[PDB]
């Protein structure tokens, strides 16, 4: 990881709860522990950045703690001013104890941040079936709890136990889909970046034959790889 200098602003919780570019919807609050953030294009990475974890701290010597806090990218920041726009909770969490309301007064603050491994204790990478799916003909899925410090750059699906693999498309954000949906239970393969190289992660059993929309399915795997910067 490198060390980056920028500014950060923040938005009301209603802008946070409201759906961001990654497609997490209301699940974004739990995913980030309340510490969700919108990031500029080079961090959003056209949705590949979704779920990237950061350590961020601010530089006001009176108001800011030295440790800072953790944030999770769940949105794309459109402003031409800051690298991040944090949730209210994330912004407050940057201050010394007792100074949360004080730091909120600033609106913007200089910050310093680095990419760090995401850690979902006792929780594997999971695959949620999005409501826009149409069970036989069309499958839309959303990756949840992507651990480590890397990016899923390509993705394959196939019937459990089949060798006929065919690719998924990143539709937008953390949402991938296909309208060539194999029958029966489904297995996935992810291309992840480790150092500079591609690495395959094989999830042998993910979606049951009778998969339902709105359900989050344990993929049986977790990512720990780190992409060089």
From TrEMBL:
Keywords: Glycoprotein, Secreted, Signal
Residues covered by the Expansin-like CBD domain: 137-219
Cysteine disulfide links: 22-50, 53-118, 58-64
A single cellular component GO annotation: plasmodesma
Keyword Signal on entry: yes
Protein name: Beta-expansin
Subcellular localization, as worded in the UniProt entry: Secreted
Pfam families for this protein: DPBB_1 (PF03330), Expansin_C (PF01357)
Gene behind the chain: LOC107921049
Family: Belongs to the expansin family. Expansin-like A subfamily.
Keyword Glycoprotein: yes
Residue ranges occupied by any Expansin-like EG45 domain in the UniProt entry: 19-123
Chain segments annotated as coiled-coil in the UniProt record: none
InterPro entries listed in its UniProt record: Expan_Lol_pI, Expansin/allergen_DPBB_dom, Expansin_CBD, Expansin_CBD_sf, LolPI, RlpA-like_DPBB, RlpA-like_sf
Annotated SUPFAM superfamilies: Barwin-like endoglucanases (SSF50685), PHL pollen allergen (SSF49590)
A biological process term (GO) from this entry: anatomical structure morphogenesis
Main location: secreted
